[PDB]
């Protein structure tokens, strides 16, 4: 009987979740930012002592976008003048502050408009990229050494990624990898020479007279891809007398015969490196293990240290092949692999033996390998209570695979079912982050005897606040189709009367290996819709979804816009059968792949849905990028899968839209899913006389994430929903 969670609450952020992010700097010490000062805490006991006062950079005379303290705490890097590029990427200005000297380093600075900077992982070495060339600083205040002379805008990329590698392979702008003690610096070089440009307008500030045409090399399904080459430089033997020597490590022969990608870079020991390559047909990948050769100065990659990974029913890995975690000697390694039942479990490999041995089994999956000591492997999975939507930390005894113990399931069972972990430098201590179903809880533990020394943050203040608002409840459950469990979640309005009939809004993503039904606690506009508009908001994970094995995940192989669409419809039906849903009032909405699925549903003719909103939807797979799209579809040639490409487009369903209300929204500057896709949607709809609502957002990207634009889009969608449900 209090006040509700309102749209203004959501947009103005009035009820905020506290976090606690630390950074381990040793085996028993981490850094936190309490009251804008950086403090160093000592886990072994309790003490805490100031590492850097907030006042230190009162004198900088620059808005400070980001900082990064070197591994040895001697130097701090200061990032200012951030100017955005894509997603994960930018340009900035950098200053280095000597913590001993308590002085800014003014001689030999890092050039303006730098693309990326990393410290070496142990000293205070620096690698940065500027105009697409790599530069190394050994001592922070002496001339950088230029590693590459070959970089060229939009063509050659040394040490940073091009659009497609950034978005779809590495999930980062960086393409540098230091060896553990910073001796070697491994890097990739991308070549976009023959890759087609996507072009689009940028309007900018009202005063720019002629719009800017932005050009990005971007391969669409089937188009010419970038090429990759791999190098390693020895940073200890750099010199100003002599251009650095980068040794090129060449891909395996099974890759050289055709288009390929470099999909993983992992260091095994101070002198051993592992590279994973993937064929453009993502059926087939090879791991190469290369040793450094103290005499010749090169890198030896023995065949029969190679390890082939094939998929007979889809692609390798969940999104890419998984990364290996080597033992300390680097002669054996652990790696998540899909087993005979098609469930992803931990595999134990010898670098010279083709076969591997599974150390876990079961109808549940390993999410990630988190830490590896000599005695124990620490990993996260969804085994607990057979819920694919939960996460917990487990540790498995390396001498007895039967001795696996669960470090988080009993910590706080009714409140915490979604854990992620951050380990100290030798897995001595670890922090546990709990994400739901209750409010997020952050604790600290020592792994010696698993004791929970400290509660870092519990969101008491937030809990207090939420007592005095009518919050919605969340149900998480499953239904059974064809002898298989498919989970869903529902956000249910306050005072939920099982007898009344509520309007329903399907929240959809449904992309391959996705998962919208989980145990995470959230404060978002579904909260607003449930709390204030008495509207049930639902998500469902049908065919081709994650973390339940390959029977479900690979179900949509070679055929997007089929099974997952069907299943989202089926879930609206199944929700009707439950009897508290007013079936004259089911909307559906989704962004990106979810916009694609929303559109496909609205055009299905099913007659189940009254209206939908599609934000930045894919409309036709030949429009999306090669890496992502071909992973699930192969090439759009008629020798391959062209039929399923063409059968599966939004525009070909245009007629059916005559039965539904449709809102179509897209940012004009979306470099990911191009405005093109929606331009094509609205064009087909016009061409068959269908009415619909639309909205462009000038200059927004795929995120539509800028403040004003974000409150605007949610307000607009709110009005469309409230109107479509004929609610006040």
Ligand X SMILES: *[C@@H]1O[C@H](CO)[C@@H](O)[C@H](O)[C@H]1NC(C)=O
Ligand Y SMILES: *[C@@H]1O[C@H](CO)[C@@H](O[C@@H]2O[C@H](CO)[C@@H](O[C@@H]3O[C@H](CO)[C@@H](O)[C@H](O)[C@@H]3O)[C@H](O)[C@H]2NC(C)=O)[C@H](O)[C@H]1NC(C)=O
Ligand Z SMILES: *[C@@H]1O[C@H](CO)[C@@H](O[C@@H]2O[C@H](CO)[C@@H](O)[C@H](O)[C@H]2NC(C)=O)[C@H](O)[C@H]1NC(C)=O
Q: Does 329 bind ligand Y (CB under 6 A)?
A: no
Q: Does 35 bind ligand X (CB under 6 A)?
A: yes
The residues with which 117 forms a beta bridge, in sequence order, are: 128
How many positions of this chain bind ligand Y (CB under 6 A)?
5
Cβ 122 to ligand Z shortest distance, Å? 7
User: Which of 44, 194, 477, 497 is the binder for ligand Y (CB under 6 A)?
Assistant: 194
Q: How far apart are CA 677 and CA 651, in angstroms?
A: 10
Q: Locate all alpha helices (DSSP H) within 587-694, ordered by sequence.
A: 593-602, 626-633, 642-647, 675-687
Residues that bind ligand Z (CB under 6 A): 149, 181, 183, 234, 236, 242-243, 270-271, 294
Site for ligand X in 474-533 (CB under 6 A): 481-482
Q: How far apart are CA 716 and CA 694, in angstroms?
A: 10
Q: Name the 3-class secondary structure at 25.
A: coil
Q: Is 531 a catalytic residue?
A: no
Q: Does 281 bind ligand X (CB under 6 A)?
A: yes
Q: Is 495 a catalytic residue?
A: no
| Lateral strand order in the sheet of 325-326 | 325-326, 332-338, 344-350, 353-358
Residue nearest to ligand X (CB): 283
Candidate ranges 29-37, 194-202, 325-333, 600-608; the one touching ligand X (CB under 6 A): 29-37
Cβ 591 to ligand Z shortest distance, Å? 45
- Which tokens hold the place of 274? 């592992």
Q: Is 497 a catalytic residue?
A: no
Whether residue 573 is preceded by a cis peptide bond, meaning omega within 30 degrees of 0, is: no
Q: Does 109 bind ligand X (CB under 6 A)?
A: yes
Site string for ligand Y, 137-176 (x = CB under 6 A): -------------x-----x--------------------
Q: 181 or 193, CB closer to ligand Y?
A: 193
141-180 as b/e: b if 16+ CB within 10 A: eeebbebbeebeeebbbbbbbbbbbbbbbbeebbbbbbbe
Residue 183's binding partner among ligand Y, ligand Z, ligand X, none (Cβ under 5 to 8 angstroms by kind) is: ligand Z
Q: Where are the beta strands (DSSP E) in 251-352?
A: 260-269, 272-279, 284-292, 299-300, 307-310, 325-326, 332-338, 344-350
Q: Tell how strand 661-667 and strand 611-615 pair up.
A: parallel
User: Which of 1, 49, 295, 726 is the binder for ligand X (CB under 6 A)?
Assistant: 49
The residues with which 39 forms a beta bridge, in sequence order, are: 32, 50
Q: Does 637 bind ligand X (CB under 6 A)?
A: no
- Which tokens hold the place of 334? 């652990």
Q: Which of 285, 592, 599, 648 is catalytic?
A: 592
Q: How far apart are CA 701 and CA 674, in angstroms?
A: 9
Q: How far apart are CA 523 and CA 521, in angstroms?
A: 7
Q: Does 36 bind ligand X (CB under 6 A)?
A: yes
Q: Does 248 bind ligand Y (CB under 6 A)?
A: no
Q: How far apart are CA 328 and CA 353, in angstroms?
A: 18
Q: Name the one residue in this structure whose structure tokens are 């916009």.
A: 595
Residue 193's binding partner among ligand Z, ligand Y, ligand X, none (Cβ under 5 to 8 angstroms by kind) is: ligand Y
Q: Does 191 bind ligand Y (CB under 6 A)?
A: yes
Q: Does 282 bind ligand Y (CB under 6 A)?
A: no
User: Which of 288, 507, 518, 567 is the binder for ligand X (CB under 6 A)?
Assistant: 567
User: Which of 193, 270, 473, 484 is the binder for ligand Y (CB under 6 A)?
Assistant: 193
Q: 152 or 558, CB closer to ligand X?
A: 558
Q: Does 726 bind ligand X (CB under 6 A)?
A: no
Contact (CB, 8 A) for 114 and 91: yes
Candidate ranges 67-75, 191-199, 294-302, 521-529; the one touching ligand Y (CB under 6 A): 191-199
Beta carbons within 10 angstroms of residue 539's beta carbon: 26
User: Which of 2, 64, 111, 578 is the binder for ligand X (CB under 6 A)?
Assistant: 111
Q: Which of 604, 619, 702, 718 is catalytic?
A: 702
SS (H, E, C) 138-154: CCCCCCCEECCCCCECC
Q: Which of 9, 458, 507, 670 is catalytic?
A: 670
Q: Does 642 bind ligand X (CB under 6 A)?
A: no
Residue ranges binding ligand X (CB under 6 A): 35-37, 40, 42, 45, 47, 49, 54, 93, 109, 111-112, 281, 283, 310, 312, 481-482, 543, 567, 634
Residue ranges binding ligand Y (CB under 6 A): 150, 156, 191, 193-194
Query: Catalytic amino acids?
Result: 592, 670, 702
């Amino acid at each position: 009987s209090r006040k509700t969670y309102t749209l203004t609450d959501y947009l103005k952020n009035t009820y905020r979740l506290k976090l606690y992010s630390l950074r381990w700097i040793s085996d028993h010490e981490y850094l936190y930012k309490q009251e804008n000062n950086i403090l160093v805490f000592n886990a072994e006991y309790g003490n805490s002592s100031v590492f850097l006062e907030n006042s230190t950079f009162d004198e900088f005379g620059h808005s400070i976008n980001d900082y990064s303290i070197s591994p040895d705490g001697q130097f701090i890097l200061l990032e200012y003048n951030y100017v955005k590029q894509w997603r994960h990427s930018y340009t900035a200005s950098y200053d280095i502050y000597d913590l001993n000297k308590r002085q800014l380093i003014t001689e030999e600075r890092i050039p303006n408009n730098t693309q990326w900077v990393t410290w070496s992982p142990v000293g205070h070495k620096l690698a940065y990229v500027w105009n697409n060339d790599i530069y190394v600083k050994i001592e922070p205040n002496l001339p950088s050494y230029r590693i590459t002379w070959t970089g060229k805008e939009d063509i050659i990329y040394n040490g940073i990624t091009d659009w497609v590698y950034e978005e779809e392979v590495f999930s980062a702008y960086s393409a540098l990898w230091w060896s553990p003690n910073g001796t070697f610096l491994a890097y990739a070089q991308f070549n976009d020479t023959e890759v087609p440009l996507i072009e689009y307008s940028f309007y900018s500030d009202e005063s720019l007279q002629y719009p800017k045409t932005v050009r990005v090399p971007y391969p669409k399904a089937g188009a010419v891809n970038p090429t990759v080459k791999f190098f390693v430089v020895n940073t200890d033997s750099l010199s100003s007398v002599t251009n650095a020597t980068s040794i090129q490590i060449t891909a395996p022969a099974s890759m050289l015969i055709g288009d390929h990608y470099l999909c993983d870079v992992t260091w095994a020991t101070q002198e051993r490196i592992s590279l994973q390559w993937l064929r453009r047909i993502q059926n087939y990948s090879v791991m190469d293990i290369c040793d450094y050769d103290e005499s010749s100065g090169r890198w030896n990659c023995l065949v029969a240290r190679q390890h082939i990974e094939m998929s007979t029913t889809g692609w390798v890995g969940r999104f890419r092949p998984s990364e290996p975690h080597f033992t300390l000697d680097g002669n054996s390694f652990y790696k998540i692999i899909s087993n005979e039942e098609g469930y992803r479990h931990i595999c134990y490999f010898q670098i010279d033996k083709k076969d591997c041995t599974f150390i876990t089994k079961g109808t549940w999956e390993v999410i990630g390998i988190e830490a590896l000591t000599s005695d124990y492997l620490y990993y996260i999975s969804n085994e607990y209570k057979g819920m694919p939507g939960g996460r917990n930390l487990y540790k498995i005894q390396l001498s007895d695979y039967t001795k696996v113990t669960c470090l988080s399931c009993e910590l706080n069972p009714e409140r915490c079912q979604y854990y992620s972990v951050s380990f100290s430098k030798e897995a001595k201590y670890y922090q546990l982050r709990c994400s739901g179903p209750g409010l997020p809880l952050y604790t600290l533990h020592s792994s010696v005897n698993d004791k929970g020394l400290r509660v870092l943050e519990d969101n008491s203040a937030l809990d207090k606040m939420l007592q005095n608002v009518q919050m919605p409840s969340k149900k998480l459950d499953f239904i059974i189709l064809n002898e298989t469990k498919f989970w869903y979640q529902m956000i249910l309005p306050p005072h939920f009367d099982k007898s009344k009939k509520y309007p329903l809004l399907l929240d959809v993503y449904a992309g391959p290996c996705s998962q919208k039904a989980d145990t995470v606690f959230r404060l978002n506009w579904a909260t607003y819709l449930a709390s204030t508009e008495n509207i049930i908001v639902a998500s469902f994970d049908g065919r081709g979804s994650g973390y339940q094995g390959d029977k479900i995940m690979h179900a949509i192989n070679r055929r997007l816009g089929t099974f997952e669409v069907e299943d989202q419809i089926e879930a609206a039906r199944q929700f009707s059968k439950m009897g508290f849903v007013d079936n004259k009032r089911i909307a559906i909405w989704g962004w990106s792949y979810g916009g694609y699925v929303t559109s496909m549903v609205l055009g299905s003719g099913s007659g189940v849905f009254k209206c939908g909103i599609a934000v930045a939807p894919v409309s036709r797979w030949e429009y999306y990028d090669s890496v992502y799209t071909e992973r699930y579809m192969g090439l759009p040639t008629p020798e391959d899968n062209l039929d399923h490409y063409r059968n599966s487009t939004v525009m070909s369903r245009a007629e059916n839209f005559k039965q539904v209300e449709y809102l179509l929204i897209h940012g004009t500057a979306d470099d990911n899913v191009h405005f093109q896709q929606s331009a094509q949607i609205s064009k087909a709809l016009v061409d068959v006389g269908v009415d619909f609502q639309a909205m462009w957002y000038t200059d927004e990207d795929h995120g539509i994430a800028s403040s004003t634009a974000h409150q605007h889009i949610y307000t607009h969608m709110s009005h469309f929903i409230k109107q479509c449900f004929s609610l006040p």
